[PDB]
Symmetry: C3
Subunit: 421 residues, 3 copies
């Protein structure tokens, strides 16, 4: 499944530099790579909506005198290659599943800079839940190539849209539900999806809230963004899922040739952190964990105002990256109550001596563990409290840099803080 | 609105010393000032209930040999002046609005020493809510001069009393409701007041509990108490709302002439702290903030037993005051959800690495953010959770002493502790 | 009530060594004492189920060459003595009440090593509540001698069993209910027992959950286990309820002659801690308090796997014990809301200065303190929140070792952790 990753990375980077050098467009500027990279993406996917010759905005000029200017560029070489490469048997069909991950990676930056909440706004649920709407805005043909990488509310938004629009309805609805029930591990959650499948949406707010307790299964992959791809000189053992990516970004960072763009120099750490969020998909991650992993503090998006408009970005510094530990991408749900037992959570004193009094429950509702028939909302709450009661998240381990020696994450005072908090 | 504050302070202090010196009553003892001050107050307000000659309890004697004794005193000079000064056009009507603030200030000490809960007891709600019953016991004609300074449960107690007693009912009820809806900023809170206005009191417990989340708008003013007023030699630029009051109390404290009374010397810090609670109305304030502001620890009322009876107080030390930061009096509600967005409050891991698991919600009820019609109690809870979710309280800033350089309050380990906790 | 404790301890130890020395069974090995001690117990209680000659498993051998082997032993001397001693008027009837406490003490080790949840499993309630099922498995005739030492769910399991099986039903049910209502101090709790008494068990989950807030009254006694009894040379002033027990265990520990058994040497601290849990009945205690009391960290049961089988235990170290503070055994419920007043729990700012915002309530439900009729579940919750609101637990004090100087427990970072947590 990753045998072709090396050669597909190579093919992307090549088409990028071919098209950039033909029009004298320097690829040591990350903004140029972002625009060139998205044009190549569009030739592989929506072959018919882009124009054979069109004008785009690049940083043109010599040796740090670059200015943004509209360059007319011709894609019919890249277009002809792209329409073949979709079905080329040499890639063993691994092309579209790879393009979808590449689009998730390369669209991450804009979802950070231009924080909106299209999916929870359309579903009419709390915008705290947009963290589970990832992969929104990917071309649909790519979405069918990576349904496990698409957040559960994207699938849920697809289901409700279906009910507000043919005999193919029985087959489309079946597969959307199928993607939903693989992601949503809760017994009460699958029951709620069943209700949604029959158009009964009363459970929506409760289902949506349950996703922060009984967390869904979201597949992650570590995919380089277009500026990294163009400036990577060796894809020899490329993976999307182990220390290679970490080592690849350190190698480019050490080259100190790729420059990054932004509104002004106060953004230079943030831009660089945005590379980590795109490649490793840590946009939703705990910032305390991230600081430990990469060895530096991460900004929250609050710490800056609105991004400037893409035409008014400027070079503001150099790409930089380093890391202290690494980890593989999570594929299973982060929390499991399998073989979990809430044990003693209260004191039964035997000494008369006074001492502080604890209650490890918010109310006696949180301890109602049910035999006598129970109501559905209580079923939900009880199942959620079981996952809430877990004190650890994740599945295996972090590794020290330069090997696979397992190092337990020690903790942080910056834990339980978040990029959009 | 404060142009007359200097001259009204002057007039109070003058009438006080005039009446004290006529009967050889020393004003360097705070208890004497408290009794003399309340007699002058009563001449300006309930002109007909006090007696022209009557006996009161003062600390009489020479040079630290004072003993408490009943002195008969004659008020008909102070009484004649008082009946004029109510309507004297030279004060521009600012007299009663000032007398009401002075009575709030000078009644604060007794509400601390003799902690009872008349308003929540009469409303039959938790006595934790007496913090919102301030200004109770003020003469009603003064209450109409400062309805924004009167706690919302005083207005609420007035409304329920009205329904348990004429065509003026439509006008009295209207104005009480009007004061209530200006103080209670919650949309669900105004709906609950509407229900109360129509005699439906089922929401009482919920309305009362909501006041600790969606906090009401309470107007504060910094007004000197009678012992400070008599011992202040300069009212030149007097305000009730900026650093002048702070500087005025430091000036008297530095004189080291005013002595304070109490049951025994173990009360001497507490008595002095009671001056801060009366003048700056910090009775409800966070003791950790207070310690930072004034630079010393504040006692909780638990740390002492019952006050002795007023006849058995003795001189126990000197008035003392100092401060490190200052702030203006709050007039708006302390919490606002305007332009507030609860953002990301949960982690979506992308690394397999295990890490601690957080849940920033007590139950999945606390995340039910609602389109589908919602029940009223949930409306309340959801609105309350929005205010509960705020992490900061207050509106502007503290200033360092001796200027208006804004200094962010850094925090304290003594925060979230309270005078009646 | 304790006048006979010295002589009853003496009689137990004597019968133990008599039967052990007759068959050359060394009593300096704790496993031998445990088996011999339980045989003597069985002769005093279920006189007819044990066999006059039978084979048991002991550590036989010389001077650290002991191996486990089946020894046939003859009890008809110990049996003849035992059938008399039950009713011997010289013990003043104090025999059975003492045997029941001795059985609670000596069965504690197995309930730790072989953690099961028979009572909550049979009641079908959360196994977090097995902490309130103590004294289960005691011979019933002993249970009637110490009903206050039997956890409330044992009595509750007895009541439900009664309803699933005669004119004596009115008298048995009455006394079980009577034991239940003395243990369960909550007004809503007694109401729930009343419902159970009439076979209405809907309240079960709520009653069971309420026991962690409104904690029941459980009687404790400090009783030596069989290995301590055999190796105690002086019962002169023996009590079950003051510093004597502490001093008695230190004396044997200092002898360094009793060896303890377990699966391997990594258990040697845990085994020794199990002596403290049996004698002082701290199985349910706060481990942070325990560490302070005895001056060493206590293991949680998680820190080890399953015990080996009793035939495969080996000597792994020496008995050891020490202590820094002591306390009497608790007899009353650990929490009381009598004369408790929740006071100010919220801030009413008077300064405009911003500051952190606290809410000392999980939801506005937790503040609903009710006049207007309230529903029963809310009655429960409100009563429970009153006990939840208490910040201190226990009734009197701890004492420093070697006297009765009261020392307030200072706290611990290891508090709110538990043996079965």
């Amino acid at each position: 499944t990753e045998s072709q990753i090396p050669k597909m990375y190579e093919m992307i980077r090549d088409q990028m530099r071919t098209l950039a050098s033909t029009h004298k467009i320097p690829l040591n500027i990350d903004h140029n790579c972002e625009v060139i990279g998205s044009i190549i993406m569009a030739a592989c996917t929506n072959n018919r909506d882009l124009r054979p010759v069109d004008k785009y905005w690049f940083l043109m000029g010599p040796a740090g005198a670059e200015v943004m200017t509209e360059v007319e560029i011709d894609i019919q070489p890249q277009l002809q290659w792209a329409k073949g490469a979709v079905h080329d048997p040499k890639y063993k069909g691994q092309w579209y599943p790879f393009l979808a991950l590449l689009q998730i990676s390369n669209k991450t930056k804009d979802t950070i800079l231009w924080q909106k909440y299209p999916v929870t706004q359309e579903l009419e649920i709390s915008n705290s839940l947009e963290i589970y709407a990832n992969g929104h805005g990917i071309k649909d043909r790519l979405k069918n190539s990576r349904p496990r990488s698409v957040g559960p509310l994207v699938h849920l938004l697809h289901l409700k849209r279906l009910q507000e629009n043919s005999p193919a309805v029985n087959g489309i609805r079946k597969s959307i539900v199928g993607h939903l029930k693989r992601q949503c591990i809760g017994e009460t959650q699958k029951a709620m999806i069943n209700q949604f499948e029959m158009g009964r949406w009363e459970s929506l707010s409760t289902f949506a809230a349950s996703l922060l307790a009984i967390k869904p299964r979201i597949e992650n992959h570590f995919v380089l963004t277009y500026p990294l791809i163009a400036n990577c000189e060796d894809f020899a053992g490329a993976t999307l899922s182990d220390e290679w990516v970490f080592k690849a970004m350190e190698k480019i960072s050490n080259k100190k040739t790729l420059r990054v763009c932004g509104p002004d120099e106060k953004w230079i750490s943030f831009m660089n952190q945005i590379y980590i969020h795109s490649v490793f998909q840590t946009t939703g991650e705990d910032l305390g964990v991230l600081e430990w992993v990469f060895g530096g503090r991460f900004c929250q998006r609050k710490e800056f105002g609105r991004y400037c408009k893409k035409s008014q970005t400027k070079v503001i510094g150099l790409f930089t990256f380093q890391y202290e530990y690494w980890s593989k991408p999570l594929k299973s749900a982060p929390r499991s109550i399998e073989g979990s037992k809430r044990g003693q959570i209260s004191c039964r004193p035997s000494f008369k001596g006074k001492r502080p009094s604890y209650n490890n429950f918010t109310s006696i509702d949180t301890l109602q563990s049910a035999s006598q028939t129970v109501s559905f909302y209580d079923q939900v709450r009880e199942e959620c409290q079981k996952y809430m009661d877990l004190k650890v998240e994740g599945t295996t381990c972090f590794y020290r840099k330069g090997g696979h020696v397992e190092v337990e994450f020690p903790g942080s005072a910056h834990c339980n803080t978040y990029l959009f908090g």
